[PDB]
Amino acid sequence: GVHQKILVCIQNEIAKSETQIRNNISSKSIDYGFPDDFYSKQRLAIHEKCMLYINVGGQRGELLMNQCELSMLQGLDIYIQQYIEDVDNS
Amino acid sequence: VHQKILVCIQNEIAKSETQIRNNISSKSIDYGFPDDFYSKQRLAIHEKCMLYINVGGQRGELLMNQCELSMLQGLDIYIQQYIEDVDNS
């Protein structure tokens, strides 16, 4: 019960990152050269990694799966902002 | 000087790749790695560093090679950590 409320908190932050990533990439300058299916392929890869935690099991395994999926999204968002910064000063 | 550095990194890349696929190929279905897990993850990493074709010059080549190494390192770490978490359950 308390556990489900926790998962909702994380799942909400995941949706914020997803939004931010999609907005960062759809920022239209082809000088950045983002592939069409970039977000989806990268998203899917992140997802498949967090699904491994189906093998830990219990509430602890669901919690790990969700914490990880968020950390990875955050790094992707950060990775994406940095590449744009690197392109601008080029 | 720049080209000699890239070789060093490209050497570290072949190494991480090796350790990673081997940790995954550690055949214990209790870890439950999907069939194309390594290649799919590797390809995602590749598509990320190729963006640095867009930086260009010597700084862009270095970043492309540098980013590829960090992502491969984090993947080995993520994978080792996952294994450790499974071991302990």
Structure overview:
Two copies of one chain form a homodimer. Chain A is mainly α. Chain A has one domain: Helicase, Ruva Protein, domain 3. Chain A contains three helices and no strands. In chain A, α1 runs parallel beside α3 and α2 packs antiparallel against α3. The longest helix of chain A has 31 residues. The radius of gyration of chain A is 15 Å and the shape is elongated. Chain A starts with a helix and ends with a helix. At the A-B interface, α2 and α3 of A face α2 and α3 of B.
Strand tally of chain A: 0
Please give the count of helices of chain A: 3
What is the N-to-C order of secondary-structure elements of chain A (H for helix, E for strand)?
HHH
What's the CATH class label of chain A?
Mainly Alpha
CATH topology call of chain A? Helicase, Ruva Protein, domain 3
How many discrete domains of chain A?
Answer: 1
User: Cα distance, first to last residue of chain A?
Assistant: 51 Å
In the CATH hierarchy, the architecture of chain A is Orthogonal Bundle
What's the shape of chain A? elongated
The value of Rg of chain A in angstroms is: 15 Å
Largest interface: A-B, 29 and 28 residues
SS content category of chain A: mainly alpha
What oligomeric state do the depicted chains represent?
A: homodimer
The helical percent of chain A reads over 70%
Protein name (chain B): Antitoxin protein TsiV3
Keywords (chain B): Disulfide bond, Signal
GO molecular function (chain B): identical protein binding
Function (chain B): Immunity protein that plays a role in preventing early activation of toxin VgrG3.
